[PDB]
Amino acid sequence: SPAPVDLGRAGDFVILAKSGISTSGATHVTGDIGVSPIDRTGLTGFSETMDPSNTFSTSTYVVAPGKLYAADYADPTPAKLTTAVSAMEAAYTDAGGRTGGLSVPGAGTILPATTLPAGVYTWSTGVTIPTGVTLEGGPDDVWIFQIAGTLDIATDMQVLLKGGAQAKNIFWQVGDVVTLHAGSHFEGNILGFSTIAMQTGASINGKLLSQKEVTLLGSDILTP
């Protein structure tokens, strides 16, 4: 079981994106979201209202007491986001740099009825999860997924946890676009180099931590 990835100040967020977060439909986020270095116009569809301090905003889509932060909000918000984004990049680099990676059968497809124990799992391709996957281990076990290409989980398919496996101990390092298809359910911390997209009724217990933009359609992003 590898050492966990330290998210540092990026772990203060449920969604953190460098180039924007968009939402439509009945989205539910439990936790704080942030965009930096893009300004507040990088938040789209939130109908957000500034706090009188101008340091944060609130939205129907970010369940109380969750707040929105943007790089052009009042001090000390720009510094907070600069620090968090630097932590996300360090986390991304740490996760992608681990050795001891295992090959998973299926040449970039997770085959039916696959159960993965704690470990580092490595692909030089993208990964597709067309029928979901099970992660089995204890409460301190760690999963680091190292994906050079895209990551997709198919419509209505699930990451299932057994044994005490916890979302906070699961890390997805992904070099290309992440797509969590309609009605899918995900677990863990997605350290995306590019877009992270969730579709209608998709859910995650964990974090979306993008070095580009996040797009949400009626999605649930829940702090465990």
Side-chain angles (χ1 to χ4, degrees):
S1 178
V5 173
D6 177 9
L7 294 184
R9 288 276 70 72
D12 298 346
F13 294 86
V14 64
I15 310 179
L16 184 63
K18 289 185 82 180
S19 336
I21 310 166
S22 70
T23 184
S24 55
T27 287
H28 308 96
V29 181
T30 61
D32 296 330
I33 74 176
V35 298
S36 175
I38 198 173
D39 64 291
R40 72 183 70 196
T41 67
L43 298 162
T44 66
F46 282 95
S47 302
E48 73 279 10
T49 311
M50 289 309 299
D51 186 78
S53 68
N54 290 312
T55 64
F56 67 90
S57 63
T58 60
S59 167
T60 185
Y61 305 109
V62 177
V63 177
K67 301 170 177 67
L68 294 81
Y69 298 89
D72 69 321
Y73 289 181
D75 300 326
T77 292
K80 170 183 171 67
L81 288 168
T82 295
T83 299
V85 168
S86 300
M88 171 173 59
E89 290 171 12
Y92 182 89
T93 294
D94 177 43
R98 300 305 185 78
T99 61
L102 307 177
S103 291
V104 182
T109 303
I110 298 191
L111 305 177
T114 295
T115 298
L116 300 174
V120 182
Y121 295 97
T122 306
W123 296 255
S124 57
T125 63
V127 168
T128 185
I129 313 179
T131 65
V133 65
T134 304
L135 308 187
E136 187 187 14
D140 301 315
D141 278 340
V142 173
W143 287 257
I144 301 172
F145 299 97
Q146 302 182 319
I147 301 170
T150 56
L151 169 62
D152 288 65
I153 180 168
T155 298
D156 288 343
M157 292 304 161
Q158 294 215 347
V159 178
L160 175 68
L161 300 185
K162 288 175 175 189
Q166 293 195 82
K168 70 180 181 170
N169 290 328
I170 299 162
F171 303 91
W172 303 81
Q173 173 271 314
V174 188
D176 205 336
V177 169
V178 173
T179 306
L180 309 183
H181 295 262
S184 68
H185 178 71
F186 223 66
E187 298 278 352
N189 302 289
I190 303 179
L191 291 156
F193 203 60
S194 188
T195 308
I196 304 171
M198 304 185 62
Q199 300 177 347
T200 304
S203 59
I204 178 170
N205 294 323
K207 299 178 188 298
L208 306 185
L209 301 175
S210 174
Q211 288 179 54
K212 296 188 176 157
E213 86 287 13
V214 171
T215 66
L216 308 175
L217 310 174
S219 305
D220 284 8
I221 303 84
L222 307 177
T223 300

